[PDB]
């Protein structure tokens, strides 16, 4: 089997991407944030605290004839951004772009943090990291991909995020018309539960490539590119007027600047992030100070190849017995 679904940016900045997901019988379509940085499928629901729901589409398991409460199961999660959610668990039928999993753990939110409430465009998350990170207690549950893997033509999924435009998530096959050149595969460590790999280095604009190993995770649920302070300072030094701002929370730059590209290495191959992809717009409405899309990971404890980097590539998440990651230009 295979699945193929279009993923769409939630706003003019590509702050995140939503993908339609069919849950239950009859289908309830929710727009979920596919997150290779986490391992819970959770949704706004009829059980969510009414004041914490503001425009989202909710899952109502009582209207699904295939929903079954997972007895005594609970979940609770906290993200790198400081957001959180928690609730109870149903199993139900979940389909993504024509690919169907029966008995999938669907985590129903009783509580969500304010950042989720305030974003009317995301109805929940669909986690695509390893199941070892799933938060369900006292019986850990498998992610959609893990449940589907054995059924897929090939045990892979691909992320093809668009810049200011829709993209595609494919399950079970590699679309060879969707990238240029060849796909370079690189090794993955699953020890922390993520798609963790080691980049071979970087370049700033037209500058020389610096060969240096940079460990990080491929994370579609993170917007920006978070890298060591040395790398990030080298980038922003090429933008006149750019500065790290503690009040803002990161590097800002004049909105009138033209940003240089940023290249990262995958083995001997190179993925180029165009400068425009690194512009995240005014720090506040009407401001001429703009927020940068490459930021320091120094506070975080891990480097993160978020959407800013991933959207410059065709990315293969290979879930073979020994997982690997593939990157191609496109």
Phi, psi (rounded to 5 degrees) for 297: -90, 0
Closest CB to ligand [Xe] among 121 and 238? 238
Chain discontinuities in the chain, listed by preceding residue (C to N exceeding 2.5 Å): none
Phi, psi (rounded to 5 degrees) for 152: -70, 150
Smallest distance, Å, CB 104 to ligand [Xe]? 35
Cβ(251)–Cβ(227) below 8 Å: no
Restricting to residues 263-282, which ones interact with ligand [Xe] according to CB under 6 A?
264
Q: Using CA atoms, how far apart are residues 129 and 143, in angstroms rounded to an integer?
A: 8
Q: Could you give the string, one character per residue 151-190, with x where binding to ligand [Xe] holds by CB under 6 A and - elsewhere?
A: ----------------------------------------
Q: What's 163-211 look like in SS3?
A: CCCCEEEEECCCCCCCCCCCCEEEECECCCCCCEEEEEEEEECCCCCEE
Closest CB to ligand [Xe] among 112 and 227? 227
Restricting to residues 74-103, which ones interact with ligand [Xe] according to CB under 6 A?
none
Q: Is 103 left (phi over 0), alpha (psi -120 to 50) or beta?
A: left
Q: Could you give the string, one character per residue 246-265, with x where binding to ligand [Xe] holds by CB under 6 A and - elsewhere?
A: ------------------x-
> Count of residues binding ligand [Xe] (CB under 6 A)?
5
Considering only residues 130, 202, 253, 291, which one is a binding residue for ligand [Xe] as defined by CB under 6 A? 202
Q: Could you give the string, one character per residue 99-138, with x where binding to ligand [Xe] holds by CB under 6 A and - elsewhere?
A: ----------------------------------------
Smallest distance, Å, CB 94 to ligand [Xe]? 34
Restricting to residues 209-238, which ones interact with ligand [Xe] according to CB under 6 A?
214, 227
Q: Using CA atoms, how far apart are residues 85 and 72, in angstroms rounded to an integer?
A: 17
Cβ(14)–Cβ(311) below 8 Å: yes
Three-class DSSP category at 313: coil
Smallest distance, Å, CB 329 to ligand [Xe]? 16
- Return the ∠ at Cα 199 (arms to 193 and 204), rounded to 5°: 135
Smallest distance, Å, CB 294 to ligand [Xe]? 10
197 part of the interface to ligand [Xe], by CB under 6 A: no
Smallest distance, Å, CB 186 to ligand [Xe]? 12
Q: Catalytic: 199?
A: yes
Identify the residue whose tokens are 């993200």.
Answer: 79
199 part of the interface to ligand [Xe], by CB under 6 A: yes
Closest CB to ligand [Xe] among 23 and 227? 227
CA neighbor of 38 nearest in space, from 284, 257, 217, 169: 217
- Which residue in the list 85, 108, 131, 199 is annotated as catalytic? 199
Closest CB to ligand [Xe] among 99 and 203? 203
Structure tokens at 226: 């978070």
HSE of 91, CA atoms in CB hemisphere, 13 A: 15
- Which residue in the list 35, 88, 219, 279 is annotated as catalytic? 35
| Residues contacting 281, CB < 8 A, separation 6+ | 12, 13, 255, 290, 291
Smallest distance, Å, CB 306 to ligand [Xe]? 12
Q: Catalytic: 35?
A: yes
User: Applying CB under 6 A, which residues contact ligand [Xe]?
Assistant: 199, 202, 214, 227, 264
Residues carrying an active site annotation:
35, 199
């Amino acid at each position: 089997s295979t699945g193929s679904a279009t993923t769409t940016p939630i706003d003019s900045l590509d702050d995140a991407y939503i993908t339609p997901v069919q849950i239950g019988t009859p289908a309830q379509t929710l727009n979920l944030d596919f997150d290779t940085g986490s391992s819970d499928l959770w949704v706004f629901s009829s059980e969510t605290t009414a004041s914490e729901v503001d425009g989202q589409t909710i899952y109502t398991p009582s209207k699904s004839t295939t929903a079954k409460l997972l007895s005594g199961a609970t979940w609770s999660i906290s993200y790198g951004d400081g957001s959180s959610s928690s609730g109870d668990v149903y199993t139900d039928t979940v389909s993504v772009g024509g690919l169907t999993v029966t008995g999938q753990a669907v985590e129903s939110a009783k509580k969500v943090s304010s950042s989720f409430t305030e974003d009317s465009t995301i109805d929940g998350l669909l986690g695509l990291a390893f199941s070892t990170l799933n938060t369900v207690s006292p019986t850990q549950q498998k992610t959609f991909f893990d449940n589907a893997k054995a059924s897929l033509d090939s045990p892979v999924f691909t992320a093809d995020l668009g810049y200011h435009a829709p993209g595609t998530y494919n399950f079970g096959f590699i679309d060879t018309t969707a990238y240029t050149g060849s796909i370079t595969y690189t090794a993955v460590s699953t020890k922390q539960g993520f798609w963790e790999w080691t980049s071979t280095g970087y370049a700033v604009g037209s500058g020389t490539f610096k060969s240096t190993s940079i460990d990080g995770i491929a994370d579609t649920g993170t917007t920006l590119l978070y890298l060591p302070a040395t790398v990030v300072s080298a980038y922003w030094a090429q933008v006149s007027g750019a500065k790290s701002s503690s009040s803002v929370g990161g590097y800002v730059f004049p909105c009138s600047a033209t940003l240089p590209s940023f290249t990262f290495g995958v083995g001997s191959a190179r993925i180029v992030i165009p400068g425009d992809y690194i512009d995240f717009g005014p720090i506040s409405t009407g401001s001429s100070s703009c927020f940068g899309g490459i930021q320091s990971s120094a506070g975080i404890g891990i480097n993160i190849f978020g959407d800013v980097a991933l959207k410059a590539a065709f990315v293969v998440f290979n879930g073979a017995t020994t997982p690997t990651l593939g990157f191609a230009s496109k």
